[PDB]
Amino acid sequence: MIKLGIVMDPIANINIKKDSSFAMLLEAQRRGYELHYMEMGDLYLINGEARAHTRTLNVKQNYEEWFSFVGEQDLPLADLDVILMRKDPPFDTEFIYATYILERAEEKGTLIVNKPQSLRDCNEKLFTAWFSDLTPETLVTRNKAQLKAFWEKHSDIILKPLDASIFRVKEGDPNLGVIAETLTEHGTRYCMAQNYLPAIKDGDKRVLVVDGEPVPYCLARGEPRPLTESDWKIARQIGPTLKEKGLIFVGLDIIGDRLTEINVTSPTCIREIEAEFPVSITGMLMDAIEARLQQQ
Amino acid sequence: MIKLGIVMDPIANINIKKDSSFAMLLEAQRRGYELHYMEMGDLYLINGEARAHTRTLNVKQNYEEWFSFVGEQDLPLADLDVILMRKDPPFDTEFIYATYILERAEEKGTLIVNKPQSLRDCNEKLFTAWFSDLTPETLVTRNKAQLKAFWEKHSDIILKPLDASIFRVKEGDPNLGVIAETLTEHGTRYCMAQNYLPAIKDGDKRVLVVDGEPVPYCLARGEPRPLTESDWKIARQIGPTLKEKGLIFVGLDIIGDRLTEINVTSPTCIREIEAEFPVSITGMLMDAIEARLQQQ
Amino acid sequence: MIKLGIVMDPIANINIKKDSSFAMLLEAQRRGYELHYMEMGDLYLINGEARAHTRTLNVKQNYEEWFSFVGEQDLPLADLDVILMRKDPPFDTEFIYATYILERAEEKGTLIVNKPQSLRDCNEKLFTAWFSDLTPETLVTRNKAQLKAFWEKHSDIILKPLDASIFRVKEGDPNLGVIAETLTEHGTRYCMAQNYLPAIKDGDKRVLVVDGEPVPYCLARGEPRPLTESDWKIARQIGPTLKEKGLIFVGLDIIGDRLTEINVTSPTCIREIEAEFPVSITGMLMDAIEARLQQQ
Amino acid sequence: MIKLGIVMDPIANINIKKDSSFAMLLEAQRRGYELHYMEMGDLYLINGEARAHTRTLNVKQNYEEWFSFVGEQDLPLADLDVILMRKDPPFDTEFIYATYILERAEEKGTLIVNKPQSLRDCNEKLFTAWFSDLTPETLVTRNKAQLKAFWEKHSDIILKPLDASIFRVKEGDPNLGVIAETLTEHGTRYCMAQNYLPAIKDGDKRVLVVDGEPVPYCLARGEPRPLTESDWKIARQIGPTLKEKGLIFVGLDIIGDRLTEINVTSPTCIREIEAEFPVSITGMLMDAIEARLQQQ
Fold first, then answer.
1. Which InterPro entries does the UniProt entry name for this protein (chains A, B, C, D)?
2. Which residues form the domain of B214?
3. Which chain D residue's Cα is nearest to C120?
4. Is A232 assigned a ligand-binding role in the annotation?
């Protein structure tokens, strides 16, 4: 069978009613995969070989007991067929170090969803710089004077840290200086400004893309909808780049007809769309994984 | 002429007697390049285009006044032929974000020394996992129990943070637990252990590699020496990988016949080797840059 | 009845088999006090008046359910007769701010165990500077050069942060510099050095003092013992100062015949001594509280 | 003569045109005091005795060279007659530890301006809780829900951290939640809210009080003015408490007829008032110090 590993934040603390990682584990188990649970602290590197302490895992939709460990072992990660990296943000240096550990197992034949080097290349907020055609006006800077000028030009902007804490600075806001100071840590940290998009009142849509192919229903933040014509247009333009970079399960954040963020670490909204619509997103994912496992 | 940009820690605070970045700027100026000075805070990104505020720079070996700005401008980074990224460690998330800014200029034709994606791929302590043949016994972990066992097996080890603060834990040291606790931040951060190498008493050599080719004299930490036979062997084995990854100016740290670290951000020791030996390392670098600029 | 309030770290996470705060709540309940539970976040200040959101609490030695809330209210803290400040270390600025909130209730007649201003005056590591006669050789400094010289003079020393992480630097340790660097954060933070006391092998005794009077049995760290002659001597010398400073429940840490630390925030070891010996430490505490409540 | 010590942030970085500490050193030198310079890192504690490395200092109004050291020594702080604690905020735990070091010298007869225990008792933002009659509506809390309700009741409020970064949240501001989240660090840190005072447009006055006596001219933030009738009223009400707490040189911040903050660490504005008006504030301070030195 396929031996599936998952690296994630502690399973004992999720909400199985909405957790997408758990929805993935149930599908994988329904297909008969052997599942191996691990957290960040379980991964290590010894003389260049990637290894982990895993626990063989069993999961079930039981609100009183949704997982159990039926075994425990130390193995080279190269023994697993596929590892799902499902660690939540922040994207910090520890996340980047775990990426090098997963890449040593990847050189030995393991499929990593998503690809380690692409996780380092494709920042969730800065990767939109590669698709400026699709995005709002975006400025990334440490300088208060540039943030002041962007606010003068656009009148109503969003200020966000790169690593929610979104400030909206409308015309007549008294705090642009304090906010710039706070997010740039007095000019020592980069932050991002975008023009505010009023279409947010119509929904912050979450579109999922499975191996480059958009799932046909999205979740407008919480109401499931079919993709509109402009949703299909954004997703078809990014899709090919996600497939070739090995970004196999991606979330795109779309407000109106603007692409605002690209989630490549732990995209969610599977349960919410699946409940209202006849699509098995977890099934599409595992079909795509299995396809990749036979392509090599 | 070539327009050379440099991103570095503030020039007003260096020691021009030993600073290698300054030694590079003097050579570039001696060849007639137009030099453009910038710090991290000068770089920004607007709708996917990389730009910076630069200052045209003039440098001279004058201990009372070694640089002056003769102009100031805002330009797209794609207007510069080559940018030297010479920012010091730490390798943190800000360093990683600046890397994406330099890579947007790189897609537009600018040569970046060293290549942005390789700066993200090649951690200075963890890239040695790709050359385990050349390195000491190395363990990377968050677990105190694994560090305890490595210390039992090797009797005398080095503990270092990934991001100097090197602890030597010899036989009979009472602090392995406190030290593991301190470097792993009670098991939440990865750290690195290696077996101690007694050949350190003979020197921590600094070998420089310019576009894959080892400079023939190194600095044993501070005494300049010709490369020994095993120094040539280590450097010839890494060299090709550095060239193809676009890691054009690299420092390797060698203790005895063991490779311990790979400096790809801001390697130094140019002045120290150049003073005692008939080699112009800065000249080798600029010849290599100019070669790369005509190869495309 | 007496209305007793307690400020503490979350009750849902303690171990009722050894927690001394819980042992205090059971005694108070056995005497019929009305108990009011609060955490740090429940305390606030409005126009100089101290107030809190409390929960009326019920406790019982049940490992499956040891507490329940039977009510909830917002009141001025001046309505409670006595508040036990049982927040764990660190002693940080938040701890210091909560102290000013408790002191506004104290001006209005509430007894605070221990007294707020004394919690600010009496640091657990630095208050020993007032009893140098009883302590080991102690140096507090940010300077590596002074720590090096103390180590030269004493050969075997203890290095500790002021805010466990105790380093022992014996003769021949290779790390004094790295350790000084780490605890002083490269000379920006004070740390403490003391000469090592070999009598630690015979026990790190925990003596409790209730309103200036030593409890006659201590816990040598884990074995309960009667106080020795030198334990009685140390405790009788500190005792009067603790009583007049309103430090009503204190822990003293004694190694051999040396006083090393003074716990004034959350002293423990009640359950361990009480189990093996015929003393009710919680009863001595509540008798002392009740005495203080009738003395005014 | 009097031997005056000063603990301050590095003298090599001040602006002698406006620095009040420097204005104090010039007056002290004009009276013939022997001046001893020290920074935080110079202070230490050995077996309960407070000591420091001092440098004998000479100062002069020379923009190219305003100070020189004419000697260097290690002494017990009890040898100095008076130490001026002139360390800038933040009020952090290091500031609190230095306070215990200065208090050990104070027990041995040294006058400390301002008194160490009062520096711990009198927080610059929270000490206003003792004079609620004079202050605006003030709430101190970690709870977003209480900050939301204060904003509903007052329509236009100020949010500030306890340890500038003042947020004004007017009617219709979209960010109260993000700001509360940012200043309380998601409910783990206390912050302060006050109702906004429109009289700020007429000036944020800085009144100085020397040993309980108000200096008769203030600086409205930058225009020097005589104290108004309500300025005299606020200062006469606080004054006696400052004198008896040994808070010898204090700054009060007054907006309109409201007391907003009490500066007890490093009050300034001496040069600005002294230039426009016939008062020697430094002379009033040294007369008060000399009076205190003969009162014991």
1. ATP-grasp, ATP_grasp_subdomain_1, Glut_synth_pro, GSHS_ATP-bd, GSHS_N, PreATP-grasp_dom_sf
2. 115-136+198-280
3. D120
4. no
